[PDB]
Amino acid sequence: YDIRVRAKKQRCINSLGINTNGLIAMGLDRNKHDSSLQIWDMNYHDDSHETINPMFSYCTNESIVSLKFLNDTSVLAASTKFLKEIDVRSPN
């Protein structure tokens, strides 16, 4: 098919990752009212809206520049001043 999606607050996309189980992550620019690491699944996405409702939101007030899915649950994300490995099963 063909679907176009975007964040709730529109800004430039730096990185992108698709997991093995279809989980999709996204690296955005820095916005003070939104998360720059949005992880969501396309099967549970409302098709009537361009915006995405993320399952997991991380890295608020940060600018993620590169990311890569390590496992089926863990993602390795790089910001402009940090390097993190964030698991979706823990908020820390």
Add this chain to the structure above:
Amino acid sequence: YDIRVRAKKQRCINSLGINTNGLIAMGLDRNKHDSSLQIWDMNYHDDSHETINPMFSYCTNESIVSLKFLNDTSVLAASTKFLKEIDVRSPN
């Protein structure tokens, strides 16, 4: 394997549903501070805790007695005084 799970507020389980894509729903009794229709996935479940973190929470202050997964996203739930079809892609 073998895993035991329960709600954040422990109460009797009335119904249970497993979807085709591995999504698991659950019908509980009536609690005034918790949702009786907890839908969650076991792959994104923290294995160090007995409690479940639900992806979608519905039917607060209600007692769901029977439920059945219609589609990969919609569930048909029955309470003690209502009969609802709740889609996970919309909060209404």
